[PDB]
Design a protein around this ligand. Structure first.
Ligand SMILES: Nc1nc2c(ncn2[C@@H]2O[C@H](COP(=O)(O)O[C@@H]3[C@H](O)[C@@H](CO)O[C@H]3n3cnc4c(=O)[nH]c(N)nc43)[C@@H](O)[C@H]2O)c(=O)[nH]1
Ligand SMILES: [Ca+2]
Length: 104
C-alpha cells in the first residue's frame, strides 16, 4: 500500500525521508538545483493543514525513486520546514494550473 498517493504515483515513508534529507541539506548549505531553484520557499497560498510551523520549503520527490538533481521536477513535492520537520506531500496532479492538492 502507499504511504502517500500523488495522482498515480505511490511513495512510501522511506521515499519521502530520502527526498526530504536531500532537500534539507541543500537548504542548510544555501545551495539550489534546477532551473526553478529547488529547494525554494513554499508560501502555502493553498492554505493546507500543516501541523508544523512555517517557513516551508518544497523539493521534488520523483516517481523513479531517484533524488532530484535538476531537469524536470515532475508534479510531486515534499514540503519541510526549518527544523527538518515534514509538513506534507503535495502535487500538482489533479489541481488546476500550477496549484497543488495534497497527496492522500
Ligand atoms: N507532471 C506534471 N507536472 C506539472 C503539472 N502542473 C505543473 N507541473 C510542473 O511542475 C512545475 C511547477 O511548480 P513549481 O513548484 O515549480 O512552482 C511554484 C508554484 O507552482 C508557482 C506559481 O505559484 O510558484 C511556486 N510557489 C511558491 N509558493 C507557492 C505556493 O504556495 N503555491 C503554489 N501553487 N505555488 C507556489 C513545473 O516545472 C511544471 O512542469 C502537472 O499537472 N503534471
Ligand atoms: Ca518507492
Amino acid at each position: 500500500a502507499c504511504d502517500y498517493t500523488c495522482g498515480s504515483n505511490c511513495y512510501s515513508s522511506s521515499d519521502v525521508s530520502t527526498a526530504q534529507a536531500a532537500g534539507y541539506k541543500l537548504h542548510e548549505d544555501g545551495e539550489t538545483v534546477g532551473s526553478n531553484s529547488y529547494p525554494h520557499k513554499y508560501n502555502n497560498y493553498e492554505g493546507f493543514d500543516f501541523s508544523v510551523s512555517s517557513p516551508y520549503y518544497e523539493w521534488p520527490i520523483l516517481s523513479s525513486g531517484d533524488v532530484y538533481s535538476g531537469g524536470s521536477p515532475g508534479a510531486d513535492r515534499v514540503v519541510f520546514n526549518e527544523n527538518n520537520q515534514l509538513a506534507g506531500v503535495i502535487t500538482h496532479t489533479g489541481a488546476s494550473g500550477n496549484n497543488f492538492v495534497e497527496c492522500t
